[model samples]
Target: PVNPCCYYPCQHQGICVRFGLDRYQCDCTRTGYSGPNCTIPEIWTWLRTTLRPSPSFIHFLLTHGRWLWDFVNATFIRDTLMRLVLTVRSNLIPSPPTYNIAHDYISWESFSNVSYYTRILPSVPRDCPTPMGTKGKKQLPDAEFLSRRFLLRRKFIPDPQGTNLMFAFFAQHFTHQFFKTSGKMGPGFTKALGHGVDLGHIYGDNLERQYQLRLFKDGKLKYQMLNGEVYPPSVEEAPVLMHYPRGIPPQSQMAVGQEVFGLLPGLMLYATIWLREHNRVCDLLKAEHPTWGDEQLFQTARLILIGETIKIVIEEYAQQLSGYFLQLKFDPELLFGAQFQYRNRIAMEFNQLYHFHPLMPDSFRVGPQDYSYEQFLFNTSMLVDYGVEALVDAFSRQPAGRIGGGRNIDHHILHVAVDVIKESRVLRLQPFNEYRKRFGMKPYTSFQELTGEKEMAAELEELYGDIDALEFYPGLLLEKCHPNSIFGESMIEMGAPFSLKGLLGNPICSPEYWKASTFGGEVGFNLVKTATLKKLVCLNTKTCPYVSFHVPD
Candidate 1:
């Protein structure tokens, strides 16, 4: 039998060890291999594997590791994971036309059976303010067992017996793509999604050069155009699928005097970071509140977390734009006002998710998670006003006449938020600088290692360390979000040039490219299916049940 390691093309100090006849293993040199072989690009691949949501197949591997279980309950698994993700958004964002908080229909019985894993673990700390009642409504949910003052016919349930990580992530992906959290676009960005792609994907370099061209209507508009040379298509897409109001042209939307002009990429990246961070909070909730039995608690905690996250998102996003304000002297009304309008619109959209969302069944615990009439009304009233205040604060910080007239105190909150973002940049630099100093080698060292495996491992570890960087997108409840700051420093340390093209090449900033390019690789969807065939043993597991089937069996 041939040694697998011998054929493994060990990158560095890794040794080739034989397993059986045809099977072999890699005993990677100290800094050589991370996974099975010394093959993983190490850091970047790991982040791509974790941070970027894997296609449906990879997500399957994450939950049960393999799909070999002969008796797996597919329906139960799908529904449970879906509810967990949807529930997180439902509780956090405000109301319908944004997200259908009540659309989920998981049963309480299944949730109890699975038992939560997040409950016993410590909860992640929120960087934003907690939600509370205001304007005669109980706006905020209780911090513990988190019941928000605003809830309607919502339901979420998970089957403990079932296992599927994809659904949870998909729900988060879907919600963020569609719901409104009030920082940039409505929470989800689903509203004006003309073709379901944006600048982030183009500039972030996630999409294929081919698909990106399609988004621009075969080179018709001239917004970011120069003699038909489209601006870097890889710029990151916005969090809100904000579309031009019917009469407005896509190019016109960014007219010279517009608020969301050149700042489109910045605003989107900032907003995305804020909401992305909040989604992480929900993930934290799952990890921390695993034992929450009642639906109200889960939902309530979600509202508080959402409120906190929105506060953070607006502040961070605003702060980043503050640089624009200072450098370009862009009017605060255009910059801050655009953001302010965005949040209020998002608040209203949050309720939209619940308007027609599916209700959870008893098996999925709809009864407990479902709110009584009085409970729903009381919470809704509070949340509406509370949400508006949260959004207005961004505007209130400007000169009184600048934002809508209000008797609120002018704390120059937006002004301070910008400083906070700058300070955070300094904080991130500390570790980054140390990392560079430790490994900041000469050019020759880099050149020599480029051809060796040790360099590969070193590169991998650094990339793995950056998995936390992607966390910024989902944690987007800050005043201003700036992933580029983190990425820029990282690139410099790694010897990556900080060119505009290189900077825009980041995939976190570009979902469209990632989504499309994902298929170009052998490891993504194909790898998962291979692993699944080796693991789970179910009847008719060849195809997903969630999607419709034409019956070829």
Candidate 2:
């Protein structure tokens, strides 16, 4: 019979010993090279041959061997043992630091410019009437299930968790805080107003980059306290407000000021409150640091305003939405101990995913008077004519639509969104499944898997024929909500992570911002710490006894 050790007797100079039959053993100096033929030592083979490793060795491996293995085989650990070790290591450190701004502001600007041009691109040929697959297809009971079933008729489904007026108010406030980039020249595009959140309304940063230019002759943003009410600067003869009978234009609308203030009196009311708060802070700072110039006052107040805005958003807005009240504390550690540089810029996808149009009801109640949507449309006159107190009271009592997979998304939005997708030529550009994969989520293989509603899945299957054919907007709306989330899984995947990163990863809360020259040291920190939406409301409405910021009994 041929001998097994005909070739090299042992590897690594080990002494190979042959047994009676086929059995053999090698005693080697190395811990892992004691096999019969002294072949390359594998973890499993070593374990098998060793029978039992010392308890201390196993414990040491359990504690520190993983890091050692990772260091040794990070480049070439193409084995089962390495893979198994990696899996355990992954569990040990699941969440890595994430960057908030995926792209630079310049890239965003370039994309905006490109998208603006593309908005007018000639419509591409689209397959008409979209395919509907299979006979006897069932309708899935999703947010739009009833809408589809009832031929797009509206259904009122009140949320079980009773109304919180603060939610609706803050939503509008937050929207105004971060204005979407309206195309430079498109439908309703004004050349004067380019794009981006015109913090001009608050900080006047849009109009004047330098802090000195933002202030009025009086060292505060142009304002007048008329008849116990604070009023922002108005252009009585401005063409935008010339057609409007009563509502005067503010000095700064930022980007969305015109649209939001022009329509929602509640938002205008909040804007005025913010305006007053700025001046209030300006006056206080002016008194405290009398030696400081208009620049110092303006910049300090601006810093305070920005800090407060961020604070309220992270503390109040996110907490209420996440329903992690008291649990969602604003940890500065996320900012100071940041693993990457903070680049705060608006994301285009942010606006697309933040479509909460359902929250706005068909009509709004102004205190004792109920105003139809038509009356409120493009009407900021209500703020001046009806008095801000009544509007504030009205909003406090009114409930915003629940953000859920319920039948709350209005037909108007659905139709408009679909048409906009086509008009903007985004239908061809954005692929729904592609985004799912990009977000580190698996693309839906079947309709049932996408929404967990057989009927809806079937309908989707019929409509698109293939998952790849699905449009972004509809896909987002139709997708199922994540566990314990009011928004769809897609939205949760995109927004939750994005927002978490943005808020936690922003530079405003970083040590750089705490510089006395930048944010004014302890004063800035103190101002931010004390800032809250509730406090702002209370401060603004202190003079008006009729309007209570508190929830209605």
Candidate 3:
């Protein structure tokens, strides 16, 4: 034979590595199969990990290298919570909207799952003091007063961790998919399309909305060749997809999955990147499966795009939170079969924690021109005018607001601060210390310990009387930031658990779902494996050396 591999001699996806004429070795090292033909399933591999003793939290910290106490707090606290959340007992509670019955036919079982937010801790507003200023005794200050006094700031503060505005901008673009709130739903209830990390922000939350964007040919999304670069179809072209809620003028509108993207320049910037990636992935899939129909191609492309995003989130976005050196594995195999519920839902607390207005600066310099918060809102055209490279460069260069406890959000968004506090009172949220104890953290004894600012501490003491009565959302905002971190001690300790659980529990992370078939084939699987934010930006943007959440030194 000329070559053994030339004849495709390997079986069960083994690679035939020919060393000489008529001789070859099938390499199954890269796959989960073994034997000469890669036919036998490699089942015993995970047993080694099981047999291997896990390092203690302190020992792991010392060995794996986390410098600050909060970084350690993020890891060790997650250790308890990750286990606590994944156990069978965690999901035994009554599912929301069907509380009387312990079962819902569709809480978190399959792909495209959507449902109410689940609660880990029982709701007991009576476990704490009455909400501050609910028209009773003159013991505590008004919630709105607390917000204006401590939460709102006159000026911006740069993040000590050296994060840039793109981080904040991208976060809004990213989280808006799920952290959605409705005035009618009231507090603690999110009216999101999908409760998972699925790219409902790009493709619609449901199929009916997505149909508007579909080209129905070659599995491509609707787009116009603007200045030789691809962009979402203009609102003039797709007038039916009007984004009137954001008050975006017709000239500034682009028909997209989420209208909120059309409200800001940076939001549209990320949206453009995903649109490009999805169409490109469709081409790859069509090329591989020449016989596949348009509907199949579009569905597979959507799945691949979502898989790519999850990889970027786990590998890049989540790692940045540690604010220090960290190496997080994106392999779902490690997380599977551990009795993890694998459910997808957002907590009201998790939703409030990621509100994240503090990271936003009052103004941003786009290229050479500056845009205030007022000028920036309802101005999606900025991305089209300046191009992706200019906006990404400007945001990457500008330092974001520091993780301030008392003063962070600017006066422009001061209404949001007040509204958030009002939301907590309406929900009668549990005390801050209660959440702290739930997350395996010690309760704060004094206001000074919580705020760390002399003036803020006195004000809080005057308001709550005892630290135990502190409200969860407001209390989480005022704590001192950790070194090199974007959030305070409580935000990391409490937020990371929910964040990690959410990422790990994605439907795609199921052992059966994580395979090559789930992504359309080996080609699609390999594509997701190569996904990185830096690579995505480089491929989509005109020119980008790197895409980073941190500002350049």
Candidate 4:
């Protein structure tokens, strides 16, 4: 009798099956090896296990020696291990239909798996608009139906685990950081700027160029009058405090790409902090390199700011939303490793996935005091009126809305999201089933399979008539959330992986952005190293004494 193992075809602990005389098959046991003869070595799998401490030891430390484990992991172990694991794929090949010329911005074709839906499908009717379920089949337009059922039910509740202002702060920051609207600007501004790219870098686009120019002296960004308080300069030549019926002059809008930057109070507050931080970084650079010209100081400071911004998001913000206990980690190799081809454009799908609208509570509040959301709603004029210190302190102390459960998202945000999608022409894209399949999930044949909530599934079924007929936004909202996840199952799965891809794929991590001249070298590295939302808050706000970086509570 011939032994199949005698040939030793399997490289890594694979079982051999004897088919017949002189014939065999390899069944690879180790995750790192697989092929005809189990000769392939999966690089990431190998790297993970090779460096990982013994399971028993890690478990023991976590269970009984909690403090020791935390210290070890927090200080260096996790970061070190993340680097090692990431090094396996030195050049991360973005999974793709590689940004082909045919793919348009609104279609989301090149940016995500859901792009196929944008193609006119023979199966789907042109009349079938999004958010299918309505209280009455009165032939109301899609926009009206969305407004009534989905957008009007605005409500908020705090996350039970106690998340903090960082979630809200970074969500807006990251939105501005990576994605910006490609909407047309008026002729007055159009000539001053080039045709806008979707993922344009953060420069105060919301504010007038004149305001930014005023803030710059000798080419370095400057802080407003030393009030220990920073505010967007009053709109150019507008009725400032002169009238009760007044607003920031349209020209004075904060210069960020998103128009919402000027609309939301919390967003403006954080944006102010960052603007101040940018100036601070510039001042420090000027002091150290007195010989450096204003242009050098300004450009280098901007690079350092971008680096620090990226670091905080991956290391602090993403991890918090993912829940720290989960295995989510910032892959440091993105910044320190190989030169991968980077497509820095933003996908519309990314914007859709990022609308963490539920993170905002219906009202802004502090200890023993609650303010109505309506009172503060669309109130940028109140930024200087209330002062940033009190609001920052209030936000630092208050908890944000819960990320999961039925009430996670507010209705007003829902309305805005619907309007945006409709206007952007993405509402014509493919149905829910296609997106699920693209994300490597089996398309739910029934609503029951999509969400474990029988009542929700039944209601969805009644509206959609079939699981395949569900709309993108509604389907994502209704799908059941995974254990300890902040979002519904599909939202978490689609958003996380794609975001990780984009984070790693960005060119900021490349040697191109990190050069001694382009970035401030050791200064840039230190800036990225020490930056945190809490640090920024404390640096900018007088009232907030100590802010926790990771813990929401």
Best by lDDT: 3
Best-performing candidate as measured by TM-score = 3
Task: Give a tens-digit lDDT track for model 1, residues 223-282.
Answer: 233233223211233222323334433332322111132232223222322232223333
lDDT accuracy of residue 218 in candidate 1: 19
Off by over 4 Å in 1: 1-100, 103-229, 232-553
Please provide TM-scores, in order, for all candidate models, with all chains considered together.
0.19, 0.65, 0.79, 0.70
The lDDT of model 2 is 0.50
- For candidate 3, the per-residue lDDT at 494 reads 71
**Which 10 consecutive positions of candidate 2 have the poorest summed lDDT?**
116-125
What are the per-residue Cα lDDT tens digits for candidate 3 across 187-234?
Answer: 555557557688888886667768878888999888887777788887
What clash count goes with each model? 110, 6, 1, 12
Q: What do the candidate models score in CA lDDT, each in turn?
A: 0.24, 0.50, 0.68, 0.54
Order of models, best lDDT first: 3, 4, 2, 1
RMSD of each: 28.0, 16.0, 16.9, 10.9
* Full ranking by TM-score: 3, 4, 2, 1
Error of 2 at 77 (Å): 35
Q: Candidate 4, residues 339-377: lDDT per residue as tens digits?
A: 345543334454555766667776677546676767676
- Candidate 4 Cα lDDT to native: 0.54
Error of 1 at 106 (Å): 1.8
Kindly list the per-residue Cα lDDT of model 2 for residues 28-140, writing each as its tens digit: 65534655656666787567646955422432443345556555445433233333322222221112221112221123443443223211111112322221112112221
Which should have the higher TM-score, number 1 or number 4?
4
lDDT of 2 at 362: 53
